[PDB]
């Protein structure tokens, strides 16, 4: 895994901001794309764009085979049993909303519980808040350990025989924690619940195998995994999808339309109403080919190296707090003592360095951490230890600067 | 308006299928894209991709300004009063589903009516079927005249003081009919109803002015108007949007998130949950710039010429039935006597010619027309009368061929 040769495929990395080479450390907000993905969109719009699932004409057939081809690539990439379990959506947020609308709203009654955790991103909070309000069910929170991990005994405590849904992130976009999904799925199933996994921050960075995890539903976003914006996937076990009603209705997802009543297509097309995200989903198949060629285990080993290096170099700085555990995904969320994280991010952008400052769509977690906001540097397959040196040198200079001020 | 110079900007037109120059006459299913749009996606992913609505770092600010910039371009393009009324979605189908979920489901009771027409595309049928079933309201159909137009007296008859919603296409994707939306909106408002306009087939081809039409909601798709797939718009009057609840929930559309309760952003962001369709919406702004540079009135005058030429040349063929009125948008849906439309479309594809055969997502209309399927040739700004000659010559040869057979 050669990082020079990988970075050479990402045109956007090769430019300056404010007179300094770009140092992009915000891949947890969105990732950058290699030429293989951008040229796959180009070749689609230059050569074979047409609407799909007619195949009466030649370009139509080629677009269809591209779109359903990419469905198979995603099936293989997360080790789903069938393409019937792979639904294309606009992103993780829409995928989790589909489960909350079609599954939760149809299966919750007063007495029932939905259990989540305090570290969840809002995409995996607000749909559940709404589904429990609609049904008169109850929402509960799994507590966190002091290093921001989840203990399985706390899971066992919170989940009861009235739990119907446990929803949890695979990897936290703030703490970097990798949650014990596979053991949490056992706990859910033992209680008679399903588990819904927010895989937006795990899928880009480590191999996913939904048969090993045994999750009931798993959601992911193309834009965080070197693929186009506007597209994601919802995986669900086929027997659950078969019994769920569609979240949206229209052409493409019907079989017969009468004046008042209609019947639905089989899966997966039951859940894909209207002309699909044709180019984006073919580009997400290209991103999967690109990542698979490098090797997800190789990219996870590179991120492990960068995260171990970052945590060590952050410990060298005085007056800097890092949140979450030592074992983690490739990101560090932090604050400088007495400097607002927004001013940290502004000063770093003057040195070329892109990081995020704010709540990271995790307000309940910020409250748990007893802070109003934090800064976050995140890493991906194109980042290097030299860029981490530049970040830690800039935080040192920021510290000195606001000191002099 | 020079058609040679326009076609030179669409790389996909310049290729052969089955040994014959491509003749693409299926723009009512999806349109082709000019280099200005494809190179706008390229320049986004090559130079300034980042997540939006943080602007703490330089690329982030540029992506944000691109995305909200394109929102303003769409506002101006349909003459909306405010960007608060312009919501980005994945397509017309999702936009109409949002109205059916957030508006209809909250405003229908037993006794209330939703009125549609028999010519509607399924996207503007099935959401209403579902919303009336959920609420115990009634669905009614405006009847059609024999040439497939709508009379305003039939509108006045069908719409009553119990109507709450009239939903209708601006232009029919089968009949080519242009509906009298502006006068239908008056009839709706006089009865106390809102009007929801499916503008998927009008927006690419003629100027839209939502203040002149006075529609309450208007939906459109990027992929039919030279823009990227996976993106559309829902326009709604600000006072209606303000009182509707979100259709989906997550990051980006919240202001404050507590453990059990959350409050929403102002419009338009209240209706855009999760990381948005950043590249696609910037490419749809580029498509609007491209179309505005040519001039929508110029493209409508070209389509009028092509449709008048086609209807005349189709009348020259024996044994060919054309459906719908003489005055129409740029498409012809037809059948050859005694030839199945699927076999017509197959034979034409062997001569390079791409058309559609089937129900065109309008099963109730096919039933009204007393046919099980039809063939459709549709036209756009890059098509020419010579291509229409090739279609009519091919139908003549198809007629002779199945005759000999």
Description of the molecule:
The structure is a homodimer of 405-residue chains. Chain A is an alpha/beta fold and 405 residues long. Chain A contains 14 helices and 17 strands. In chain A, the strands form 5 sheets. A 7-stranded mixed beta sheet of chain A has the order 4-10-9-8-7-5-6, sandwiched between helices. A 4-stranded antiparallel beta sheet of chain A has the order 13-14-17-16, covered by helices on one side. A two-stranded antiparallel sheet of chain A has the order 1-2. The interface between A and B is large, with 88 and 88 residues.
Which key phrases capture this entry?
4-stranded antiparallel beta sheet; transferase (chains A, B); alpha/beta; 405 residues; globular; 7-stranded mixed beta sheet; 2 domains; homodimer; pyridoxal phosphate binding (chains A, B); Aspartate Aminotransferase, domain 2
Quick structural summary:
With 405 residues, chain A is of the alpha/beta class. Chain A has helices at residues 3-8, 35-48, 58-78, 92-107, 126-135, 152-158, 181-190, 210-213, 238-243, 278-294, 296-315, 341-350, 363-368, 385-404; strands at 16-17, 20-21, 23-24, 86-89, 113-117, 138-142, 163-169, 194-198, 217-221, 232-236, 254-257, 262-264, 320-323, 331-336, 353-354, 356-358, 374-378.
């Amino acid at each position: 895994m050669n990082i020079t040769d990988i970075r050479e495929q990402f045109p956007i990395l090769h430019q300056q901001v404010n007179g300094h080479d770009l140092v992009y450390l915000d891949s947890a907000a969105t990732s950058q794309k290699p030429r293989a993905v951008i040229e796959t969109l180009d070749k689609y719009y230059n050569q074979y764009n047409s609407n799909v699932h007619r195949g009466v004409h030649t370009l139509g057939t080629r677009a269809t085979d591209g779109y359903e081809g990419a469905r198979e690539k995603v099936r293989k990439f997360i080790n789903a049993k069938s393409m019937a379990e792979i639904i294309f959506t606009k992103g993780t947020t829409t995928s989790l909303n589909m489960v909350a609308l079609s599954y939760a709203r149809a299966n919750l009654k007063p007495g029932d519980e939905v259990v989540i955790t305090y570290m969840e991103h809002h995409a995996n909070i607000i749909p559940w808040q709404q589904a429990v309000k609609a049904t008169g069910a109850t929402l509960k929170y799994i507590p966190l350990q002091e290093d921001g991990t989840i203990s399985l005994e706390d899971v066992r405590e919170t989940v009861t025989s009235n739990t119907k849904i446990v929803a949890v992130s695979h990897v936290s976009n703030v703490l970097g924690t990798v949650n014990p999904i596979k053991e949490m799925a056992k706990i859910a199933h033992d209680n008679g619940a399903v588990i819904v996994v927010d895989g937006a921050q795990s899928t880009p960075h480590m191999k996913i195998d939904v048969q090993d995890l045994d999750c009931d539903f798993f959601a992911l976003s193309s834009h965080k995994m070197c693929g186009p914006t506007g597209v994601g996937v919802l995986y669900g076990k086929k027997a659950l999808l078969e019994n769920m009603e569609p979240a949206e209705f229209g052409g493409e997802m019907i079989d017969f339309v009468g004046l008042y009543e209609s019947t639905w297509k089989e899966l997966p097309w039951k859940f894909e109403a209207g002309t699909p995200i044709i180019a984006g989903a073919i580009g997400l198949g290209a991103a999967i080919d690109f990542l698979e060629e490098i090797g997800l285990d190789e990219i996870s080993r590179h991120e492990h190296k960068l995260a171990a290096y970052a945590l060590e170099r952050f410990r060298q700085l005085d007056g800097v707090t890092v949140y979450g555990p030592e074992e983690r995904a490739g990101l560090v969320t932090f604050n400088l003592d007495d400097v607002h994280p927004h001013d940290v991010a502004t000063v770093l952008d003057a040195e070329g360095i892109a990081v995020r400052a704010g709540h990271h769509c995790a307000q309940p977690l910020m409250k748990w951490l007893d802070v109003t906001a934090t800064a976050r540097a995140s890493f991906y397959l194109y980042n290097t230890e030299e860029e981490i040196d530049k970040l830690v040198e800039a935080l040192q200079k920021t510290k000195e600067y606001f000191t002099n001020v």
